[PDB]
Amino acid sequence: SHNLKLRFPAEDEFPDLSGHNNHMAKVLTPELYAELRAKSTPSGFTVDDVIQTGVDNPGHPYIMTVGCVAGDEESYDVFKELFDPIIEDRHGGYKPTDEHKTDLNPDNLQGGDDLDPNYVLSSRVRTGRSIRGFCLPPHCSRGERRAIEKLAVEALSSLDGDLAGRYYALKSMTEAEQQQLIDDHFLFDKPVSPLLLASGMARDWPDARGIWHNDNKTFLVWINEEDHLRVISMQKGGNMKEVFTRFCNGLTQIETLFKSKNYEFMWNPHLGYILTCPSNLGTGLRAGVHIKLPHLGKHEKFPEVLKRLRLQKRGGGVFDVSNADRLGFSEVELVQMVVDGVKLLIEMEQRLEQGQAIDDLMPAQK
């Protein structure tokens, strides 16, 4: 009914993106908008819905945001003329005809049981999943969201052994529970990012949002936040293989429990696992270490070494280092790049501790 909009000429509806630094604004032309503005997915998601967050949020002079979302699985097909250039730009030339390979077999990961714990304080692997048949968080109704929560909580409650756990719904969380989850670094709250708020994803908060974690505090699931599920495996030290093993183990057990009720993860062979933001497609995966690199930290070539290693850093020489890629590399490929990359970083750190050069250890661009 409101898509009333189509009675206005395209140019009167077309967003003013003059200031903007985001992927959407780089691709959305007046002709593209005219081509796509009458279209909708079966759940009613439109190109205005796709682009709203990028209209509202112009990015930063020095940081390009994505500037759009999917509202359902179909969005990536119905609006491919928009998403495809964005995905190619964001994902280093990933083409519409490229194939994504999924690989969640930890036997395929070589080594990484052993990352030096005088350097690696901690290891983590995180992803997201969407449940097929439901709209994504920008667009999901209260009913859809409740249904997702019920499915997820029922599956997780079935898990035993190493993955026995419990669920904390945000609406009923106590102050003591909250404080314990903060100390655990397990808590999420309503988003304050305007990138997320502008998409409609925070509606009805805290309805049907919660946190599940295993008793051992090595496996964590967030339900109905940025994506239907966020799934994290973590522990102290340097056994990234153990971390990834538990990660794949938990995912498969969940996935099989959903399958028993005829629910599937959203997935295809081109984009891999489907999630709300195009930046998270393919694997949705961030595998990281918190790593003590005081010397390499201050070193001039360190940004290049990370680049060659296909690695990234964030948060006074403790760095959170992870894989940069998400799409067109398998989960095993990404975790392997972290494992292999970290061993080399530590080698270089050790040169620098000895007052030695590292120049010759500069790796070929992966």
Side-chain angles (χ1 to χ4, degrees), residues 114-171:
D114 47 28
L115 305 175
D116 186 338
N118 296 325
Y119 293 89
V120 178
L121 296 166
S122 66
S123 302
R124 181 179 180 274
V125 189
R126 173 270 283 172
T127 194
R129 293 287 182 278
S130 309
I131 302 181
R132 178 173 289 151
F134 296 106
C135 294
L136 299 177
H139 193 60
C140 60
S141 73
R142 285 190 289 270
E144 288 183 285
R145 195 193 291 119
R146 290 164 181 179
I148 290 160
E149 179 193 29
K150 182 175 111 79
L151 295 174
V153 166
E154 289 188 356
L156 295 161
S157 75
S158 286
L159 302 178
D160 41 47
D162 175 65
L163 295 183
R166 84 185 276 182
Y167 182 62
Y168 301 91
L170 303 186
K171 161 87 180 154

Coordinates of all heavy atoms in Angstrom, one line a residue, residues 114-171:
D114 N 48.6 -26.0 19.4 CA 49.9 -25.7 20.0 C 50.3 -24.2 20.0 O 51.5 -24.0 20.3 CB 51.0 -26.5 19.2 CG 50.8 -26.4 17.6 OD1 50.4 -25.4 17.1 OD2 51.2 -27.3 16.9
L115 N 49.4 -23.3 19.7 CA 49.9 -21.9 19.5 C 50.5 -21.4 20.8 O 50.0 -21.6 21.9 CB 48.8 -20.9 19.0 CG 48.1 -21.4 17.7 CD1 46.9 -20.4 17.4 CD2 49.0 -21.4 16.5
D116 N 51.7 -20.8 20.7 CA 52.5 -20.6 21.9 C 51.9 -19.8 23.1 O 51.6 -18.7 22.8 CB 53.8 -19.9 21.5 CG 54.9 -19.9 22.6 OD1 54.5 -20.0 23.8 OD2 56.0 -19.7 22.3
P117 N 51.5 -20.5 24.2 CA 50.7 -19.7 25.2 C 51.5 -18.7 26.0 O 50.9 -18.0 26.7 CB 50.2 -20.8 26.1 CG 51.2 -22.0 26.0 CD 52.0 -21.7 24.7
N118 N 52.8 -18.6 25.8 CA 53.5 -17.4 26.3 C 53.2 -16.2 25.4 O 53.5 -15.0 25.8 CB 55.0 -17.6 26.4 CG 55.4 -18.6 27.4 OD1 54.8 -18.7 28.4 ND2 56.4 -19.4 27.1
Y119 N 52.5 -16.4 24.3 CA 52.1 -15.3 23.4 C 50.6 -15.2 23.2 O 50.0 -14.1 23.4 CB 52.8 -15.4 22.0 CG 54.3 -15.2 22.1 CD1 55.1 -16.3 22.4 CD2 55.0 -14.0 22.0 CE1 56.5 -16.2 22.5 CE2 56.3 -13.8 22.1 CZ 57.1 -15.0 22.3 OH 58.5 -14.9 22.4
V120 N 50.0 -16.3 23.0 CA 48.5 -16.4 22.8 C 47.8 -16.6 24.1 O 47.8 -17.6 24.7 CB 48.1 -17.5 21.8 CG1 46.6 -17.6 21.7 CG2 48.7 -17.2 20.5
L121 N 47.1 -15.5 24.5 CA 46.3 -15.5 25.7 C 45.0 -16.2 25.6 O 44.5 -16.8 26.5 CB 46.0 -14.1 26.1 CG 47.3 -13.3 26.4 CD1 47.0 -11.8 26.5 CD2 47.9 -13.8 27.8
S122 N 44.5 -16.2 24.3 CA 43.1 -16.7 24.1 C 42.8 -16.9 22.7 O 43.3 -16.2 21.8 CB 42.0 -15.9 24.8 OG 42.0 -14.6 24.2
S123 N 41.9 -17.9 22.4 CA 41.4 -18.3 21.1 C 39.9 -18.3 21.0 O 39.3 -18.7 22.0 CB 42.0 -19.6 20.8 OG 43.4 -19.6 20.8
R124 N 39.4 -18.0 19.9 CA 38.0 -17.8 19.7 C 37.6 -18.0 18.2 O 38.3 -17.7 17.3 CB 37.7 -16.3 20.0 CG 36.2 -15.8 19.9 CD 36.1 -14.3 20.4 NE 34.8 -13.6 20.4 CZ 34.3 -13.0 19.3 NH1 34.9 -13.0 18.1 NH2 33.2 -12.3 19.4
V125 N 36.5 -18.7 18.0 CA 35.9 -18.7 16.7 C 34.4 -18.3 16.8 O 33.7 -19.0 17.5 CB 36.0 -20.1 16.0 CG1 35.6 -20.0 14.6 CG2 37.4 -20.6 16.0
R126 N 34.0 -17.4 16.0 CA 32.6 -16.9 16.0 C 32.0 -16.9 14.6 O 32.7 -16.7 13.5 CB 32.6 -15.4 16.5 CG 31.3 -14.7 16.4 CD 31.1 -14.0 15.0 NE 31.9 -12.8 14.9 CZ 32.1 -12.1 13.8 NH1 31.7 -12.5 12.6 NH2 32.8 -10.9 13.9
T127 N 30.7 -17.3 14.5 CA 29.9 -17.1 13.3 C 28.5 -16.6 13.5 O 28.2 -16.5 14.7 CB 30.0 -18.4 12.4 OG1 29.5 -18.1 11.1 CG2 29.2 -19.5 13.1
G128 N 27.7 -16.5 12.4 CA 26.2 -16.3 12.6 C 25.5 -17.3 11.7 O 26.1 -17.8 10.8
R129 N 24.2 -17.6 12.1 CA 23.3 -18.4 11.2 C 22.0 -17.8 11.1 O 21.5 -17.1 12.1 CB 23.3 -19.8 11.7 CG 24.5 -20.6 11.6 CD 24.9 -21.0 10.2 NE 26.1 -21.8 10.1 CZ 27.3 -21.4 10.1 NH1 27.5 -20.0 10.0 NH2 28.3 -22.2 10.0
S130 N 21.3 -18.0 10.0 CA 19.9 -17.7 9.8 C 19.1 -19.0 9.6 O 19.6 -19.9 9.0 CB 19.7 -16.8 8.7 OG 20.5 -15.6 8.7
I131 N 17.9 -19.0 10.1 CA 17.0 -20.1 10.0 C 16.1 -19.8 8.8 O 15.2 -18.9 8.8 CB 16.1 -20.4 11.3 CG1 17.1 -20.5 12.5 CG2 15.2 -21.6 11.1 CD1 16.3 -20.8 13.8
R132 N 16.1 -20.7 7.8 CA 15.3 -20.6 6.6 C 13.8 -20.6 6.9 O 13.3 -21.3 7.8 CB 15.7 -21.7 5.6 CG 14.9 -21.7 4.4 CD 15.4 -22.7 3.3 NE 16.6 -22.2 2.8 CZ 17.6 -22.8 2.3 NH1 17.7 -24.2 2.3 NH2 18.7 -22.2 1.7
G133 N 13.1 -19.8 6.2 CA 11.6 -19.6 6.3 C 11.2 -18.5 7.2 O 10.0 -18.1 7.3
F134 N 12.2 -17.9 7.9 CA 11.9 -16.7 8.7 C 12.6 -15.5 8.1 O 13.7 -15.6 7.6 CB 12.4 -16.9 10.1 CG 11.7 -18.0 10.8 CD1 12.4 -19.2 11.0 CD2 10.4 -17.8 11.3 CE1 11.7 -20.3 11.7 CE2 9.8 -18.9 12.1 CZ 10.5 -20.1 12.2
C135 N 12.0 -14.3 8.3 CA 12.6 -13.1 7.9 C 13.8 -12.8 8.8 O 13.8 -13.2 10.0 CB 11.6 -12.0 7.9 SG 10.3 -12.1 6.7
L136 N 14.8 -12.0 8.3 CA 15.9 -11.6 9.1 C 15.6 -10.5 10.0 O 14.5 -9.8 9.9 CB 17.0 -11.2 8.1 CG 17.5 -12.3 7.1 CD1 18.6 -11.8 6.2 CD2 17.9 -13.5 7.8
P137 N 16.5 -10.2 11.0 CA 16.0 -9.2 12.0 C 15.6 -7.8 11.6 O 14.8 -7.3 12.4 CB 17.3 -9.2 13.0 CG 17.9 -10.5 12.8 CD 17.7 -10.9 11.4
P138 N 16.0 -7.2 10.5 CA 15.5 -5.9 10.2 C 13.9 -6.0 10.0 O 13.3 -5.0 10.2 CB 16.2 -5.6 8.9 CG 17.5 -6.3 9.0 CD 17.1 -7.6 9.6
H139 N 13.4 -7.1 9.5 CA 12.1 -7.3 9.1 C 11.2 -8.3 9.9 O 10.0 -8.1 9.8 CB 12.2 -7.7 7.6 CG 10.9 -7.6 6.9 ND1 10.2 -6.5 6.7 CD2 10.3 -8.6 6.0 CE1 9.2 -6.7 5.9 NE2 9.2 -7.9 5.5
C140 N 11.8 -9.2 10.7 CA 11.0 -10.3 11.3 C 9.9 -9.7 12.2 O 10.1 -8.7 13.0 CB 11.8 -11.2 12.1 SG 12.7 -10.6 13.4
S141 N 8.8 -10.3 12.2 CA 7.7 -10.0 13.1 C 7.9 -10.6 14.5 O 8.8 -11.5 14.7 CB 6.4 -10.5 12.6 OG 6.3 -12.0 12.8
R142 N 7.2 -10.1 15.5 CA 7.3 -10.6 16.9 C 7.1 -12.1 16.9 O 7.8 -12.9 17.6 CB 6.3 -10.0 17.8 CG 6.7 -8.6 18.3 CD 5.8 -8.1 19.4 NE 4.5 -7.8 18.8 CZ 4.1 -6.6 18.3 NH1 5.0 -5.6 18.2 NH2 2.9 -6.5 17.8
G143 N 6.1 -12.6 16.1 CA 5.8 -14.0 16.0 C 6.9 -14.8 15.4 O 7.3 -15.9 15.9
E144 N 7.6 -14.3 14.3 CA 8.7 -15.0 13.8 C 9.8 -15.2 14.8 O 10.5 -16.2 14.9 CB 9.2 -14.3 12.5 CG 8.2 -14.4 11.3 CD 8.9 -13.7 10.1 OE1 8.8 -12.4 10.1 OE2 9.3 -14.4 9.2
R145 N 10.1 -14.0 15.4 CA 11.2 -14.0 16.4 C 11.0 -14.9 17.6 O 11.9 -15.6 17.9 CB 11.4 -12.5 16.8 CG 12.7 -12.2 17.5 CD 12.7 -10.8 18.1 NE 12.6 -9.7 17.2 CZ 11.6 -8.8 17.1 NH1 10.5 -8.9 17.7 NH2 11.7 -7.8 16.2
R146 N 9.8 -14.9 18.1 CA 9.4 -15.9 19.2 C 9.6 -17.3 18.7 O 10.1 -18.1 19.4 CB 8.0 -15.6 19.6 CG 7.9 -14.3 20.4 CD 6.5 -13.9 20.5 NE 6.4 -12.6 21.3 CZ 5.3 -12.0 21.5 NH1 4.2 -12.4 20.9 NH2 5.3 -10.9 22.2
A147 N 9.3 -17.6 17.4 CA 9.4 -18.9 16.9 C 10.8 -19.4 16.8 O 11.1 -20.5 17.1 CB 8.6 -19.1 15.6
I148 N 11.7 -18.5 16.3 CA 13.1 -18.7 16.3 C 13.6 -19.0 17.7 O 14.4 -20.0 17.9 CB 13.8 -17.5 15.6 CG1 13.5 -17.5 14.1 CG2 15.3 -17.6 15.9 CD1 13.7 -16.1 13.5
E149 N 13.2 -18.2 18.7 CA 13.7 -18.4 20.0 C 13.3 -19.8 20.5 O 14.1 -20.5 21.1 CB 13.2 -17.3 20.9 CG 13.7 -17.5 22.3 CD 12.9 -16.6 23.4 OE1 11.7 -16.3 23.2 OE2 13.6 -16.2 24.4
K150 N 12.1 -20.1 20.3 CA 11.6 -21.4 20.8 C 12.3 -22.6 20.2 O 12.8 -23.5 20.9 CB 10.1 -21.6 20.5 CG 9.5 -22.9 21.0 CD 8.0 -22.9 20.7 CE 7.6 -23.9 19.7 NZ 7.6 -25.2 20.5
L151 N 12.5 -22.6 18.9 CA 13.3 -23.6 18.2 C 14.7 -23.7 18.7 O 15.3 -24.7 19.1 CB 13.3 -23.2 16.7 CG 12.1 -23.3 15.9 CD1 12.4 -22.8 14.5 CD2 11.6 -24.8 15.9
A152 N 15.4 -22.5 18.8 CA 16.8 -22.5 19.3 C 16.9 -23.0 20.7 O 17.8 -23.9 21.0 CB 17.4 -21.2 19.1
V153 N 16.1 -22.5 21.6 CA 16.2 -22.8 23.1 C 15.9 -24.3 23.2 O 16.5 -25.0 24.0 CB 15.2 -22.0 23.9 CG1 15.1 -22.5 25.4 CG2 15.8 -20.5 24.0
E154 N 14.9 -24.9 22.5 CA 14.6 -26.3 22.6 C 15.8 -27.1 22.1 O 16.2 -28.0 22.9 CB 13.3 -26.7 21.8 CG 12.1 -26.1 22.6 CD 10.7 -26.5 22.1 OE1 10.6 -27.2 21.1 OE2 9.8 -26.1 22.8
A155 N 16.4 -26.8 21.0 CA 17.6 -27.5 20.5 C 18.7 -27.4 21.5 O 19.3 -28.4 21.9 CB 18.1 -27.0 19.2
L156 N 19.0 -26.2 22.0 CA 20.2 -26.1 22.9 C 20.0 -26.8 24.2 O 21.0 -27.3 24.9 CB 20.5 -24.5 23.2 CG 20.9 -23.8 21.9 CD1 20.7 -22.3 22.1 CD2 22.3 -24.1 21.5
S157 N 18.8 -26.9 24.7 CA 18.5 -27.5 26.0 C 18.7 -29.0 25.9 O 18.8 -29.6 26.9 CB 17.0 -27.3 26.4 OG 16.1 -28.1 25.6
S158 N 18.7 -29.6 24.7 CA 19.0 -31.0 24.5 C 20.4 -31.3 24.6 O 20.8 -32.5 24.6 CB 18.6 -31.3 23.0 OG 17.2 -31.3 22.9
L159 N 21.3 -30.4 24.5 CA 22.7 -30.7 24.4 C 23.2 -31.1 25.8 O 22.7 -30.6 26.8 CB 23.5 -29.5 23.9 CG 23.1 -28.8 22.6 CD1 24.0 -27.6 22.4 CD2 23.3 -29.8 21.5
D160 N 24.1 -32.1 25.8 CA 24.7 -32.6 27.0 C 26.2 -32.7 26.9 O 26.9 -32.3 26.0 CB 24.1 -33.9 27.5 CG 23.9 -34.9 26.4 OD1 24.8 -35.0 25.5 OD2 22.7 -35.4 26.3
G161 N 26.8 -33.4 28.0 CA 28.2 -33.5 28.0 C 28.9 -32.2 28.1 O 28.5 -31.3 28.8
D162 N 29.9 -32.1 27.2 CA 30.8 -30.9 27.1 C 29.9 -29.7 26.7 O 30.3 -28.6 27.0 CB 31.8 -31.1 26.0 CG 32.7 -29.9 25.7 OD1 33.4 -29.6 26.7 OD2 32.6 -29.3 24.6
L163 N 28.7 -29.9 26.1 CA 27.9 -28.8 25.7 C 26.6 -28.6 26.5 O 25.7 -27.8 26.1 CB 27.5 -28.9 24.2 CG 28.6 -28.9 23.2 CD1 28.2 -29.0 21.8 CD2 29.4 -27.6 23.4
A164 N 26.5 -29.3 27.6 CA 25.4 -29.1 28.5 C 25.4 -27.6 28.9 O 26.5 -27.1 29.2 CB 25.4 -29.9 29.8
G165 N 24.3 -26.9 28.9 CA 24.2 -25.5 29.3 C 22.9 -25.0 29.8 O 22.1 -25.8 30.2
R166 N 22.8 -23.7 29.7 CA 21.5 -23.1 30.1 C 21.3 -21.7 29.4 O 22.2 -21.1 28.9 CB 21.5 -22.8 31.6 CG 22.2 -21.6 32.1 CD 22.1 -21.7 33.7 NE 20.8 -21.2 34.3 CZ 20.6 -21.2 35.6 NH1 21.6 -21.7 36.4 NH2 19.5 -20.8 36.1
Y167 N 20.0 -21.3 29.4 CA 19.5 -20.2 28.7 C 19.1 -19.1 29.6 O 18.4 -19.3 30.6 CB 18.3 -20.6 27.8 CG 17.8 -19.4 27.0 CD1 18.5 -18.8 26.0 CD2 16.5 -19.0 27.1 CE1 18.0 -17.8 25.2 CE2 16.0 -18.0 26.3 CZ 16.7 -17.4 25.4 OH 16.2 -16.4 24.6
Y168 N 19.5 -17.9 29.3 CA 19.1 -16.6 30.0 C 18.3 -15.7 29.0 O 18.9 -15.1 28.1 CB 20.3 -15.8 30.5 CG 21.1 -16.6 31.5 CD1 22.2 -17.4 31.0 CD2 20.8 -16.6 32.8 CE1 23.0 -18.1 31.8 CE2 21.7 -17.4 33.7 CZ 22.8 -18.0 33.2 OH 23.6 -18.8 34.0
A169 N 17.0 -15.7 29.1 CA 16.2 -14.7 28.4 C 16.5 -13.3 28.9 O 16.6 -13.1 30.1 CB 14.7 -15.0 28.5
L170 N 16.6 -12.3 28.0 CA 17.0 -11.0 28.5 C 15.9 -10.4 29.4 O 16.2 -9.8 30.4 CB 17.3 -10.0 27.5 CG 18.5 -10.4 26.5 CD1 18.7 -9.2 25.6 CD2 19.7 -10.8 27.2
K171 N 14.6 -10.6 29.1 CA 13.5 -10.0 29.8 C 13.5 -10.5 31.3 O 13.2 -9.6 32.2 CB 12.3 -10.5 29.0 CG 10.9 -10.4 29.8 CD 10.2 -9.1 29.6 CE 8.9 -9.1 30.3 NZ 8.6 -7.7 30.7

